[PDB]
One Martini backbone bead per residue (centre of mass of N, CA, C, O) as a GRO file, in nm:
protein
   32
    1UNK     BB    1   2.851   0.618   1.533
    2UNK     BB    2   2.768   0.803   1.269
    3UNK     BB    3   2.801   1.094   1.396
    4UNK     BB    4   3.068   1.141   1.500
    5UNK     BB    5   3.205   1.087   1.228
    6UNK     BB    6   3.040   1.351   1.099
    7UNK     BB    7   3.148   1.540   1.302
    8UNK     BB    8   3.473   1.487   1.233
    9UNK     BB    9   3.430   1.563   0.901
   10UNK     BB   10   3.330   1.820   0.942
   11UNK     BB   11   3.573   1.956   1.134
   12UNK     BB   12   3.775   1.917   0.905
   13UNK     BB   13   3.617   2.112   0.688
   14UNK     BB   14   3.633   2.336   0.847
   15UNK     BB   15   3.964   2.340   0.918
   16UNK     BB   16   4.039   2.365   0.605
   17UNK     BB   17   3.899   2.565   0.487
   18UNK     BB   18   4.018   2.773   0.740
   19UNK     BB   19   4.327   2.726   0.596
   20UNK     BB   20   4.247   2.812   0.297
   21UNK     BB   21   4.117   3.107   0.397
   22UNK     BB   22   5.016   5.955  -0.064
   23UNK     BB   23   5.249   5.999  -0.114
   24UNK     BB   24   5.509   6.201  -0.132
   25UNK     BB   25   5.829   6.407  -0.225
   26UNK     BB   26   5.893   6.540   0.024
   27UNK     BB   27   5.902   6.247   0.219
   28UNK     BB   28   6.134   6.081   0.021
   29UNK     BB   29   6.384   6.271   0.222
   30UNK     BB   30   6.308   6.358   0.480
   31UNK     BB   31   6.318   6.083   0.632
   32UNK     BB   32   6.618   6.050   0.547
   0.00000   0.00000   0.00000
């Protein structure tokens, strides 16, 4: 059952990764 604890260990690993992983000046008035 060491395997399952593996992968339960990384799939936490791997979701903490994820986890934590022009303009003009007539323009400026145009559009005001």
């Amino acid at each position: 059952x060491x395997x399952x604890x593996x992968x339960x260990x990384x799939x936490x690993x791997x979701x903490x990764x994820x986890x934590x992983x022009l303009l003009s000046k007539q323009r400026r008035r145009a559009v005001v």
